[PDB]
Amino acid sequence: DIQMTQSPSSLSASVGDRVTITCQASQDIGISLSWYQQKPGKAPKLLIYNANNLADGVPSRFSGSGSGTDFTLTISSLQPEDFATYYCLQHNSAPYTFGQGTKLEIKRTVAAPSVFIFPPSDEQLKSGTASVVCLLNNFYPREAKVQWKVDNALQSGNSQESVTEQDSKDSTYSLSSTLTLSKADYEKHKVYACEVTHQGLSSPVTKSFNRGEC
Amino acid sequence: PHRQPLTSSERIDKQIRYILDGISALRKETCNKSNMCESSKEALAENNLNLPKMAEKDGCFQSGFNEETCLVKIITGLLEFEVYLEYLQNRFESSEEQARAVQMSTKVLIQFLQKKAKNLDAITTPDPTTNASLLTKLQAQNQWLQDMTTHLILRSFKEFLQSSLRALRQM
Amino acid sequence: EVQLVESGGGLVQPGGSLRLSCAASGFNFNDYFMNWVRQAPGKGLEWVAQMRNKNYQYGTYYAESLEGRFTISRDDSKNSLYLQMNSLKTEDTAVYYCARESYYGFTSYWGQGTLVTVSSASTKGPSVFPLAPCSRSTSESTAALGCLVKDYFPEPVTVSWNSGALTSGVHTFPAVLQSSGLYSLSSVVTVPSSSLGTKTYTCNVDHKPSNTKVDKRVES
């Protein structure tokens, strides 16, 4: 089977900048390569077919280049709607092969997160489990560290994290961290805290509550 | 209408013309559908193909004619084409019989020519393994590349047989 | 218009079999090669199989990574494409797209895709709990509130706020898969802190696989 090496895997660029994405095929595929754009929650969209032909209605800032084994997708002057994941498709010989994809994200200025902590609800507590949630709202860049502390003891292995896709209006990220404890372990303790480290913060920010005050 | 027995050469001549007539019917069908044998980008399909062709060194042209080297080249060439004729079998339904006829007739021709040769020492037989992989490779391609591959085989096989016919008339 | 509609998706146990369907309309189905493509949650596109037409003797091709576990087929009298999946593993959990293949080989039309989840877990509606701070802040200009959508299976759930009237400042996070095999996600909204107590905030949670609908009014 023909293998595709797509590069780079991720790309951070400014609105108005120019980017190139490359695909290499493991053997000659002529011009039988196409380029796809995919937005979150949607089916992929054809941009360029047979190496260099623009699909109907595709803006001319998109252009495809190459023949044989080495191929390039160029986007000139990035517009906000162009930030998405891009894939090459080898369609010379079956089985066809997609490249690994390039996730293209908007570069913006640093934004510190707003941090919030939520205790478990009384309704959840009735069921024997306690979820403690920490929210980091609208920050940039994506890189952020959340650490949990219960009565000042660092937690490990009992939390999960989830991060949104870059916001379509302000280009920020949000992160949700959930600490999970049994009701019994939850009640054994007083101070629940989430400490956040981020480039936008000069020093780490801690949000906490006391169990008996909720 | 009665006639005397055909000589070996006349039999060979008739065999080639029969195959050419069949190739012509196949070509007609290919070029009346799909890309209509539009051939601007046919170099793309040609990359995967090592189609036999005459060159002056083969001694099949009037100038520099050499009966022995030419006959060897014709037999070697036809043996190499067989994998490509196998490829053509799937590409024609609504013409199964015709594609089948071309393939069978070429096999008959090869035997006629091998009788004429003796010896066959200089004859390079194509490798079966190489042929099976090649066939797989060709069949895996998208429809456009397959249409172009089909046209290239038909044209190239026609050309090889036309030159062969001319040369064999001098033997 | 060309339409491709997948059916037959859903949950299946590890080792199980599932048959996907695709109903095509708005073109001569018979003339076209068709493909299946899949995408695991948060992962790249993976080409799956090709179904050729009558002219090409209904030939079939498969990604090698599938190791022959999948079988593609078509029914031209019904304008339908099928993907029979066998010996399913958790790594086969993905959205599966039906797709029309061009003469030139590239994918030209796509269905909306159908999710297949391979797991030992059983269908389960979510428990929805409010997210509200321990007490109101007096200093801060922005407040956050939300709902925790816990222990459901399979994906997906949809969350709206105030029946779709509140959209600004809403973040619905990607589900995490817990060690229990059940999913959990949170949906939050930030609001001016001066709005608190002047207005109701209700998250509306929808989980079609269990046919559950839950409105949770959040008090903060």
Author numbering:
A (entry chain B): 1 to 214
B (entry chain D): 14 to 184
C (entry chain A): 1 to 220
From the primary publication:
Interleukin-6 (IL-6) is a pleiotropic cytokine that plays a central role in immune regulation and inflammation. IL-6 interacts with two receptors, gp80 (also known as IL-6 receptor [IL-6R], CD126) and the signal-transducing co-receptor molecule gp130 (CD130),1 to form a hexameric signaling complex. Formation of this signaling complex is thought to be a stepwise process during which the IL-6 molecule first binds to gp80 at Site 1 to form a dimer, and subsequently to gp130 at Site 2 to form a heterotrimer.
To determine the epitope and understand the mode of action of olokizumab further, the crystal structure of the Fab portion of the antibody in complex with IL-6 was determined. The structure (resolution 2.2Å) shows a 1:1 complex between IL-6 and the Fab fragment of the antibody. The epitope of olokizumab lies in the gp130-binding region of IL-6. The IL-6 residue trp157, which is known to be a critical mediator of the IL-6:gp130 domain 1 interaction, makes extensive hydrophobic contacts with tyrosine and phenylalanine side chains from the heavy chain of the antibody. The interface between olokizumab and IL-6 is highly interdigitated; most importantly, residue gln156 protrudes from the surface of IL-6 into a pocket formed by the CDRs of the antibody. There are numerous direct contacts between IL-6 and olokizumab, including 19 hydrogen bonds, as well as several contacts mediated by buried water molecules. These suggest that the interaction between olokizumab and IL-6 is both entropically and enthalpically driven. However, when we compared the structure of IL-6 bound to olokizumab with that of IL-6 in its signaling state, we found several unusual conformational differences, i.e., IL-6 residues arg104 and trp157 underwent significant side chain rearrangements. As a result of these conformational differences, the gp130 receptor-binding pocket (located on IL-6 between trp157 and residues 50–60) is occluded and structurally closed when IL-6 is bound to olokizumab. The crystal structure of the Fab portion of olokizumab in complex with IL-6 strongly suggests that the mode of action of olokizumab involves steric blockade of the interaction between IL-6 and domain 1 of gp-130.
